[model samples]
Target: MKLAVYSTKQYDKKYLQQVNEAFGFELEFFDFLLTEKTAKTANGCEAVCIFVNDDGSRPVLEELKKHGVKYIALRCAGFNNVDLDAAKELGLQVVRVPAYSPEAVAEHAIGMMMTLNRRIHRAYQRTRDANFSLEGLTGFTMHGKTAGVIGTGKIGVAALRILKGFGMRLLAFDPYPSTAALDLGVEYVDLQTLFAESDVISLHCPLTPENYHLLNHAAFDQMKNGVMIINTSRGALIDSQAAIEALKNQKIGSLGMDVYENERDLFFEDKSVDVIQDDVFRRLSACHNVLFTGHQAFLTAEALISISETTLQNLSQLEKGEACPNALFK
Candidate 1:
């Protein structure tokens, strides 16, 4: 009944230590990620709590099976990093923190937009040097803008409510539509119509095979010129190269991204002295119109506490031979 917590942080230990005081087995840490080779470290552990960046490939799951590991508890919501089918094939059950405080992510998305629009990030540096020039500080009002919300999940609904408060026109596109947005006058539309009319497009959908690379050259072309784009959603949903090209072409005026497509190695870790091998992301960082937040959108004190509590509960239910509803899929 021990759990090998892969790619753990100070917060994970601090919170788990506080929450699992009554019932605990073990919580181990490593500076390493749970890769194919690192999978051997799971020997004798009943479960393994992995991070989003950890290797969840077919081979890794097979290794977990061999090492006597069973449950795959994901501390984050985005299970794209995990090979769910492979885990299932190997009889590995999985669970995740599906919906943390949506406000943490939703508010961060809006904050990133505000930072991009107002150039507050740049202003902070300029003001420090006593040079206050409003050269690149021009921005439009969001009051009359059409904001396209792609998904109606908790985060999407929270963002939609905020946009509604701004007196915005909301365009929605979701396979499983929610009537709740209709109360806020969120107009339901096909993908193209939403792309074409939205002044600010905020992506909130989970990444799936059908909608992989949802935002690309043609999608950007359908949008209005100088449209603001925000992505607090999954990385693969939008093509980074396409977004960069759009930014260069000025079709995308401002971009606020909390996640990047190929950011597993660099997102949660610091590479201050090392050169970034991801050239596309380095180029993206060079863009003044683009702002990247290193995937900290779901980072909140409340959410971390909940994550620890929920993970402990999963362990409790599993030890008692009960089904954890969240463990239905990887």
Candidate 2:
């Protein structure tokens, strides 16, 4: 069976081909995004593999159905980009790589937290320009501070473990709490308490309609002044506009994000020469206390290998007429 992979980057092509050697599935990789206009490219494929930024809406799914695409294989977790109801109505089987390397994302979040708090990235730039100075480089210790972790899933648990090793007090908010986190002396609390008491907060949750803007204006009002925030999960978890106000007022001392709410057009591409039209993102980028990445926290070798293997396994399961363990929905 053939698999059509859209939005294929060099790294994705390299990793997928390396894993496909074991699976023996014919793969047709396209650098273009999977949108309704480009759905015809998957005409001969039995499955279409997509990334986070691809358009998996109803119109695209309907076009894919016309092309005989039966399976939708997401190389990453977080299927919010895909319309589940539309996929179900189209009789398309959706599968995803649920858990790759949790440590990859968790450690990246911690690295961002350290970089933002200590201004390491800024210092590196200054030193490169031979302007080495210790001014404005002051950073507090994380040893005794309380870190709040939202969403106690595998990634959140990994982050909690690292923070615990730093000797920081742990507070967690999750509708479904983790026993492992509890064993690590994490006190599960409500969102209000976590926001009010935490010195540092990290988000590790899936994007849903209900929790689209979980950290909005009202939520920021509840947070302690000078709070540091880190987000390695979905971008829409925090309201960027509200966050700008928080930063302007010093309510948030620092922010580090591996994902951005308006990242679809900006990330995964070289935009150095292009004029940034999104003023909010531009303002956020100009902030001295902000540290942002191009959503590459999960780009580690181990995680990529796992993602490719799981993605191939999902396709293989479909070929064998077996249910995939990581099936999102039918």
Candidate 3:
């Protein structure tokens, strides 16, 4: 088997090399994204192991089909990038790491909420610039405050459990109720009530077309005044323009974001001196009530190896003509 892996980063190369050794597959790594223009490199490859931002649109899939690429192996739990309906119609087998170290992501969301609420990111930046001013950094404790979780997936459940240790009021909203959240004292409610009662709104839901802009103007209108919004889930879940407008009006108290809309061509890339073209992101960055972490909620040493191992395992299963337990759509 020959595979083309795109959107390279500081991945654990030793494990990947072992994946090649074990599978007897000539895997080629590309630092640049594989697009219609860049899809020519996979002319003879059997599969393509793509990252989250690799533009897995209809055209990209068709271009890969023009070559000999058949597999779209996603190394992350999120599959919003790939058009699964198209991939299935094209006879392209798709697989993903359905779950990998959920605690890493869950804890990062918690960490973002903590830092944003307490202005820890602000304090650190101010001290580094030799301007120690605490005039605008007043934070209350989490104890006895309402903590609401949006989704009830593994990461969401883990985060809900962690909030219990802080003695915070636990509230959650899930389309499909989670028995685990109920076991952990999570009170499930409608979206409007969750927004109205929650002091902190931590998002853990996946992004889909139906709810792409769930947190737009109308959603924020119902949010409790001074509501601290936390999103560690998909960026598209919240409308960036609406968020910026909310911030400008002081409708949102604090924002904790690990992901952003229009993150493609931005996240997991070299931007040491590059100009950010996304105006909403740039404007949002100027707010003291916000904390952005470059969509790095899942970057961890343990998660990397887990991604590599599960990706290769999925590849192996597909090669053996076996169906994946977690993969169903494409």
lDDT, each prediction: 0.81, 0.87, 0.80
Best by TM-score: 2
Runs of candidate 2 with Cα error greater than 4 angstroms are 57-68, 80-92, 207-213, 216-222, 260-277
Backbone clash pairs for candidate 1 read none
Q: Write the per-residue lDDT of candidate 2 for residues 1-330, one digit (tens) a residue.
A: 899999999999999999889989899989999999999989999999998889999999999999999999999876788999999988998999886698999999999999888889889989999998989878889999999999999999999999999999999999886789889899999999999999999999888897888998899999999899998887788886688788888899899888543464433212345654554455566764887787878888778988999999988898788978888865
TM-score for predicted model 1 compared with the true structure:
0.82
Question: For model 2, what is the error of residue 256's alpha carbon versus the real structure, in angstroms, after optimal superposition?
Answer: 1.3
For model 1 the local lDDT of residue 100 reads: 75
TM-score of 3: 0.81
Q: How many pairs in model 2 have backbone atoms within 3 A of each other, for residues 3 or more apart or on separate chains, i.e. clashes?
A: 0
Q: Choose the strongest candidate by lDDT.
A: 2
